[PDB]
Design a protein around this ligand. Structure first.
Ligand code: SF4
Ligand SMILES: [N+]
Ligand SMILES: [N+]
Ligand SMILES: [N+]
Length: 83
């Protein structure tokens, strides 16, 4: 059961970025974003995930203010967590 503030499927930004809560049901391969092979990409290893926001598997994403994403999710703004 997703948190009340989870990013949802008719969120316009989620649609535009092709977010999914489950990276295995994402188009990460098609996008081929740089920094890791696409099968290795998900929110937990993304620069925009906010480790100090949320709880458990439901964490912040800077691009989705006021929302939570799933650490196992993905979107097309995936960028390696570098610092
Ligand atoms: S920007 Fe990164 S942390 Fe935010 S939803 Fe996309 S992949 Fe997940
Ligand atoms: N939500
Ligand atoms: N597609
Ligand atoms: N956030």
């Amino acid at each position: 059961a997703a948190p009340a503030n989870a990013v949802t499927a008719d969120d316009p930004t989620a649609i535009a970025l092709k977010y999914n809560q489950d990276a295995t049901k994402s188009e990460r391969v098609a996008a081929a974003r740089p920094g890791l092979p696409p099968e290795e990409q998900h929110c937990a290893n993304c620069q925009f995930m906010q480790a100090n926001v949320g709880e458990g598997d439901w964490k912040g994403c800077q691009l989705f203010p006021g929302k939570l994403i799933n650490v196992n999710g993905w979107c097309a703004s995936w960028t390696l967590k570098a610092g």
